């Protein structure tokens, strides 16, 4: 039933400040310039509408930095990761957490008379340009399969009706939050990735809390870790890494 879009990598890293500070100044500046040159490649790709990327600083110890990358193939995600790891800066960007998934759409008007992969209204959700909002939030999730709270043993109808209320709660946040749903069954450790974008970080809390009182989330939601962060403008990269 779902339409699949761009592959997605969330690549979180922790900064080894102690090691970075021992690198001579000239090698640090070179490393920053090298990394900025890489991101410039990403920006050209995003300008050509052949992928997208978001770079946020993450608050707390689960990570310091998120690179969220959308590309048309799994190979390209691998290529990006590898290029990143071969930069000098990446030596100081230790592993923290990662997620591999694919942009997934279930909600669209299906007529049968068109290839939806060629319809503009659909493509712009399949192949999204990521929002450049002040804040981001990521978490992965499963649908529960435990006792009488087993999502996958429900009827289609029952699932549809449960998902109605979920949609209704989302509608309350129109123009306040945007959500990128990626599917990861068969690709990583949970079933979906949820990435929220907002200019107001409080809306992540309002929205995710309000959702939790809908039956689909209360009885069927299993959630992983939540990562929240602030946009890192590429103009601020040098000062962020300045020591």
Residues identified as active-site = 139
Residue 228: CB minimum distance to a second copy, A: 5
- Looking at the Cβ atoms of 36 and 187, the one nearer to a second copy is 187
Phi/psi-derived region of residue 148, left when phi > 0, alpha when psi is between -120 and 50, beta in every other case: alpha
CA distance 193 to 185: 10
- Cβ proximity of 204 and 198 under 8 Å: yes
Max CA separation in the chain (angstroms) = 63
Token pair, residue 88, equals 């000098």
Closer CB to a second copy, residue 72 or residue 128? 72
**H/E run at residue 165:** helix 156-171
3-state secondary structure of 6: strand
By beta-carbon proximity to a second copy, the closer residue of 161 and 189 is 189
Cα gap 195→8, rounded to integer Å:
11
**34 lies in the site for a second copy, by CB under 8 A:** no
Site string (220-239) toward a second copy, x via CB under 8 A = -x---xx-xxx---------
Q: Which stretch binds a second copy (CB under 8 A): 13-21, 25-33, 122-130, 162-170?
A: 13-21
Least distance between a second copy and beta carbon 71 (Å):
11
| CB of residue 41 to a second copy, shortest distance in Å | 18
Residue from the set 106, 185, 234, 236 that interacts with a second copy by CB under 8 A? 185
Which residues within the stretch 63-92 sit at the binding site for a second copy (CB under 8 A)? 74-75, 77-78, 81-82, 85-86, 90-91
Quick one: which of 8, 3, 10, 36 has its CA closest to 241?
36
Pick 161 or 215: Cβ nearer a second copy: 215
SS3 98: strand
Restricted to residues 95-154, the positions that interact with a second copy (CB under 8 A) are 95-100, 102, 134-135, 137, 139, 145-150, 152-153
User: CB neighbours (10 Å) of residue 234?
Assistant: 13
């Amino acid at each position: 039933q779902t339409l699949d879009g761009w592959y997605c990598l969330h690549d979180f890293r922790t900064i080894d400040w102690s090691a970075w500070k021992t690198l001579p100044n000239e090698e640090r500046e070179a490393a920053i310039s090298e990394f900025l040159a890489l991101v410039d490649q990403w920006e050209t790709t995003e300008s050509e509408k052949q992928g997208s990327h978001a770079v946020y600083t993450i608050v707390g110890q689960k990570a310091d930095i998120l690179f969220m990358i959308l590309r048309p193939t799994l190979d390209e995600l691998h290529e990006i990761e590898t290029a990143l790891n071969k930069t000098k800066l990446a030596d100081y960007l230790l592993p923290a957490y990662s997620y591999v998934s694919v942009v997934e759409l279930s909600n669209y008007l299906a007529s049968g008379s068109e290839d939806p992969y060629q319809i503009p209204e659909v493509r712009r959700r399949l192949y999204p340009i990521l929002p450049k909002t002040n804040y981001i939030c990521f978490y992965p999730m499963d649908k529960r399969r435990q006792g009488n709270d087993n999502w996958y043993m429900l009827s289609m109808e029952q699932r549809r009706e449960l998902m109605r209320a979920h949609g209704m709660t989302g509608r309350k946040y129109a123009g306040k939050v945007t959500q990128i749903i990626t599917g990861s069954v068969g690709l990583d450790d949970f079933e979906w990735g949820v990435t929220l974008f907002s200019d107001d970080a409080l809306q992540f809390k309002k929205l995710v809390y309000e959702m939790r009182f809908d039956e689909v989330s209360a009885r069927f939601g299993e959630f992983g870790s939540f990562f929240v962060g602030t946009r890192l403008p590429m103009e601020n990269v040098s000062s962020f890494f300045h020591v």
